[PDB]
């Protein structure tokens, strides 16, 4: 059983990668670069790429992700890369002419602003139409090394096929803001049946193809019907949204789900990133932290041993467990901003197998040296993810 080296439920393989260098390793899971590799290479008609941004540094594992892309592309593969526009900022631009260069590929920007006032941010793959990739990896060298990082390949046809249609809407919203077109909203018809099973949650609803569930309706129902526990690893937590001249307005609708659970009774476990530490955001933690039944530990990753890198050695990875019955796994922060008007996608898998690893992975986490409670009285340091 134990040198099995993957981790499925039907329709879906959970995927993950651990920094280098810490006590985070799961052999059982497949990691992100050996399984975005096998994905391209199974390509035979299509391949479709959403991303926030795309980094990359010489030698490291994401060029053996490039390589396999160039070469499905090379078959005939035909490639539609979609990006977001404030993600060209993040980019490497010897990286962007590199995929452009590949036979077969569009790339496309997309300032995702234009239609609902935030961004492209989910990061996810489309493969023949057959199969998905969803989770926190950006399309970054250091998603796939340095970055505590978890997702899923789905194979559950009717998931890939609301993920294709999410997909091909927002590759020709592009090309109608290109040409300064009007992007219709989409009209919201949910169905009157509550979620049940296995299924796709995105944002943001104006641009939801028909009956495709949205995330920011579904996270606070699923919050309300926890019994027991609820157990959350995000990098930032946050009820605020980033908006005009620098402001961060109040934003309420996740913090009161969980404010909500906990006084039920319901026990909360947050973790997050050290990054979340920054202000004024550690003082909101702070506040959720009083809060009857919630434990908070924030996680500090160390710097890998060749030294420094910016953004990197962190926890990346969007999960969330309730009761142990009900798994999570999303590309979405929870702050504002990404529920509301981002394009975000995330999996709400009703599946025992799943939440228990999941649990398991969020245990190896939370019982590290690498976490910590929070602490009320302490003046956190302004994290510095860039250096310096």
Same mark, same amino acid.
């Given at each position: ?34 399984? !975005?590799?096998?994905? #391209? ?39 539609? #890369?979609?990006?977001?526009?404030? =993600? ?49 990896? +950006? #399309?970054? !060298? ?7 990082? $978890? ?46 099973? +296995? ?8 641009? +939801? ?33 980033? =908006? ?81 019955? $009900?798994?999570?796994?999303? $590309? ?57």
């Amino acid at each position: 059983h134990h040198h099995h080296h993957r981790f499925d439920i039907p329709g879906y393989e959970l995927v993950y990668t651990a920094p280098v260098e810490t006590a985070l390793q799961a052999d059982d899971l497949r990691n992100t670069a050996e399984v !975005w590799q096998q994905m #391209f290479d199974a390509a035979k008609t299509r391949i479709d790429l959403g991303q926030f941004y795309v980094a990359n540094q010489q030698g490291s594992l994401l060029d053996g992700v490039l390589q396999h892309l160039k070469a499905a592309g090379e078959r005939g593969v035909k490639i539609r #890369f979609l990006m977001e526009e404030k =993600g060209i900022r993040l980019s490497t631009p010897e990286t962007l002419e590199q995929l452009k260069a590949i036979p077969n590929l569009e790339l496309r920007i997309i300032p995702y602003r234009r239609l609902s006032g935030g961004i492209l941010h989910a990061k996810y793959l489309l493969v023949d139409g057959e199969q998905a990739f969803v989770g926190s990896q +950006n #399309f970054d !060298w250091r998603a796939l090394e340095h970055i505590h990082e $978890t997702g899923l390949r789905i194979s559950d046809a009717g998931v890939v096929g609301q993920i294709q249609a999410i997909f091909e809407q927002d590759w020709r919203a592009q090309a109608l803001l290109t040409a300064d077109k009007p992007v219709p909203q989409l009209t919201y018809q949910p169905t009157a049946a509550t979620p049940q099973g +296995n299924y796709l949650v995105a944002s943001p609803r104006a641009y +939801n193809p028909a009956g495709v569930i949205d995330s920011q309706v579904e996270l606070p129902r699923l919050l309300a019907s926890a019994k027991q526990r609820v157990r959350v690893q995000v990098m930032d937590y946050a009820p605020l949204s980033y =908006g005009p001249e620098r402001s961060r307005p109040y934003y309420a609708v996740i913090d009161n789900a969980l404010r909500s659970a906990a006084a039920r009774g319901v026990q909360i476990e947050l973790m997050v990133a050290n990054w979340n530490t920054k202000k004024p955001d550690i003082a909101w933690l702070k506040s959720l932290a009083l809060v009857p039944n919630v434990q908070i530990k924030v996680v500090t990753i160390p710097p890998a041993s060749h030294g420094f890198i910016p953004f990197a050695r962190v926890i990346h990875s969007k999960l969330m467990t309730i009761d142990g019955e $009900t798994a999570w796994v999303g $590309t979405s922060n929870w702050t504002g901003g990404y529920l509301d008007n981002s394009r975000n996608l995330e999996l709400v898998l009703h599946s025992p197998a799943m939440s228990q690893r999941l649990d398991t992975l969020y245990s190896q986490l939370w019982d590290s040296v690498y976490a910590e409670p929070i602490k009320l009285d302490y003046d956190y340091p302004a994290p510095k993810p860039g250096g310096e």
